[PDB]
Amino acid sequence: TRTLWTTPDTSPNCTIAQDKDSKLTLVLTKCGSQILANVSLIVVAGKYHIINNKTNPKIKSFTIKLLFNKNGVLLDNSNLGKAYWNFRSEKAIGFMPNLVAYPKPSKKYARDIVYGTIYLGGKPDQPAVIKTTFNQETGCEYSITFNFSWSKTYENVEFETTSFTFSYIAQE
Amino acid sequence: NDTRTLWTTPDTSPNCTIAQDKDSKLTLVLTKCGSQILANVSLIVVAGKYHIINNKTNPKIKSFTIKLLFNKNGVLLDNSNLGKAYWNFRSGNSNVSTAYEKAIGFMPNLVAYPKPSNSKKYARDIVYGTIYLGGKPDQPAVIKTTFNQETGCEYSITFNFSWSKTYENVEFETTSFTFSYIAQE
Amino acid sequence: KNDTRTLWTTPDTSPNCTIAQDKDSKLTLVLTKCGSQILANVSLIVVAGKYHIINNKTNPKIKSFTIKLLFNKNGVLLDNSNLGKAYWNFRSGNSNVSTAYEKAIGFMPNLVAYPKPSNSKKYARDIVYGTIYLGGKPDQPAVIKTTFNQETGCEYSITFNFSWSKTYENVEFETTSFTFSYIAQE
Ligand SMILES: CO[C@]1(C(=O)O)C[C@H](OC(C)=O)[C@@H](NC(C)=O)[C@H]([C@H](O)[C@H](O)CO)O1
Ligand SMILES: CO[C@]1(C(=O)O)C[C@H](OC(C)=O)[C@@H](NC(C)=O)[C@H]([C@H](O)[C@H](O)CO)O1
Ligand SMILES: CO[C@]1(C(=O)O)C[C@H](OC(C)=O)[C@@H](NC(C)=O)[C@H]([C@H](O)[C@H](O)CO)O1
Ligand SMILES: [Cl-]
Ligand SMILES: [Zn+2]
Ligand SMILES: [Zn+2]
Ligand SMILES: [Zn+2]
Ligand SMILES: [Zn+2]
Ligand SMILES: [Zn+2]
């Protein structure tokens, strides 16, 4: 009970636009008052599988949400499936984003956001932005939201990313 | 009583003096993971010269610095920009009740990051990151963190915030950035 | 002390790494085990040889180099790594423990997360990109590309590829520091 994670393989665990179209790899490790997080994404099918902004310039972003109840347990309306989220060998308030650092919705402060850049197919001229926001969803006690977005014109690029590390302040 | 975390608390009460007294909230969390300190930082400027950036009027106002200076016991010195009242080991969402006496285990390692008297200054005592003003992706600013480069102290962490875009009425309140550094002991 | 949770190069400036000439650089690498994740901190000081002072007006083709750490099934550094074995060990104070370690599997990159090379589809999650700055100057970026388990002739590997695209003129290759993490094998 120091790491909460998805399994590290590439089997689909996540639904963005159609069922089980993606594999989110998310590893949360509790280092006392901070959670060390490591994230990457493979889209395996559907709308976001192959990006072509030549033919669809307005398809530029999508969102994966993780919603948690008051005990830190993943809710079923999350994009990530509950069967795929477990401690490495179910309550987990110590992994939740701190509500004083990152308050629930209602102008708020930007420190509840972390930005990073990952790269599609591992190619250094294929950046995409991963925007991570804490506790800004409703209908839950805690949340972590990943928004993936890009501004370059990609032409038939498969959406599979390099890895990004961040941290956040833990609820307890 | 989390003896592995030194922090500012996560509230929004100003705790830092950049240009005028208590004009900002520096949120800084230092978590000891053995030989490395995991650090998380953000800044909210609430008043004064840096609260609203307008480079149309003053195109030369493009940076400022926040210094944390520590003595030989790792205790924050009063000439730091960060106030001492707010800086302590964590208890819940607040601080432990009494001011700490020793925190050498959280200081930047002096062999990795030597004092300015050193023969050679090495760039490894610097970490660069980018944060975003108002959380907007087209409002980057650079946070440059430097270890042990101040004088008049045993240890120091310096944050320099700067930007190169011409911002017009942009409030200086940032997204969060994580880094680490090698601990003294 | 005797810090079993840190595998490192020590933090001194003694050259320990061979890029183009023997012991022409100091790779400062600290691997700190936080359970299932390794917290990693890296920087590079080149002190001699062809990558010490970059001048792309005179040498326009010098734009990248790679430092490889290769490990066996026990997580022991192999002798054909760029990093010397004498310098790589568990931590004691600001130095290393006295005897060379025999097992460090808990610090190796996870083989399920970062599979070895094959003929099947290769996925990007075994790469982390960062930007560091030469001489600490904000207008002298270089890219550090870290790749897990993509070398052959080993059980595990961490490789650091350094590259840049600006035309630098007499710039000393000493980098700022970069932190990343990766999923541990055990
Ligand atoms: C032109 O600007 C970019 C680009 O191609 O979009 C920015 C990008 O960095 C970001 C943060 O997106 C950078 N890639 C990395 C991994 O740093 C590349 C790279 O330097 C060159 O393409 C040469 O490989 O240059
Ligand atoms: C033009 O270059 C920048 C910019 O606006 O200054 C660079 C910036 O990245 C850095 C490291 O400053 C990047 N923001 C993020 C969050 O990565 C934005 C963003 O891609 C576009 O604005 C589209 O939203 O583009
Ligand atoms: C022009 O674009 C760059 C550059 O000079 O190459 C990109 C570089 O960022 C990257 C990720 O390479 C950035 N440096 C930092 C530390 O963010 C500098 C900086 O903003 C200005 O030079 C002002 O000092 O601008
Ligand atoms: Cl695919
Ligand atoms: Zn396909
Ligand atoms: Zn205001
Ligand atoms: Zn405001
Ligand atoms: Zn220590
Ligand atoms: Zn030199």
Author numbering:
A (entry chain B): 183 to 271, 281 to 297, 300 to 365
B (entry chain A): 181 to 365
C (entry chain C): 180 to 365
From the paper:
The HAdV-D36 fiber knob domain (FK), which mediates the primary attachment of many HAdVs to host cells, has a significantly elongated DG loop that alters known binding interfaces for established adenovirus receptors such as the coxsackie- and adenovirus receptor (CAR) and CD46. Our data suggest that HAdV-D36 attaches to host cells using a versatile receptor pool comprising sialic acid-containing glycans and CAR. Sialic acids are recognized at the same binding site used by other HAdVs of species D such as HAdV-D37. Using glycan microarrays, we demonstrate that HAdV-D36 displays a binding preference for glycans containing a rare sialic acid variant, 4-O,5-N-diacetylneuraminic acid, over the more common 5-N-acetylneuraminic acid.
In contrast, HAdV-D37 showed preferential binding to 3’SL over 4-O-Ac-3’SL and bound to several other sialyl glycan probes in the array. In the case of the HAdV-D37 fiber knob, the two key polar interactions occur between residue K345 and the carboxyl group of Neu5Ac and between the backbone of P317 and the sugar’s amide nitrogen, respectively. In HAdV-D37, the N-acetyl group is accommodated in a canyon-shaped cavity formed mostly by two tyrosines (Y312 and Y308) from the neighboring monomer, as well as V322, which occupies the position analogous to F325. HAdV-D37, on the other hand, mediates only water-bridged contacts to the α-face. Interestingly, the O-acetyl function does not contribute any polar contact and instead induces the tilting movement under the steric influence of the bulky side chains of Y315 and P323. This interaction is supposedly not favorable for the binding; however, the steric constraints bring the O-acetyl groups of the three sugar moieties into a position in which they contact each other by means of a triangular hydrophobic interaction (mean distance between methyl C atoms: 4.3 Å) that displaces water molecules in the area. In the complex structure of HAdV-D37, the steric influence of the two residues Y312 and P320 is observable to the same extent, but the overall arrangement of the knob trimer does not allow the formation of this hydrophobic interaction (mean distance between methyl C atoms: 5.2 Å).
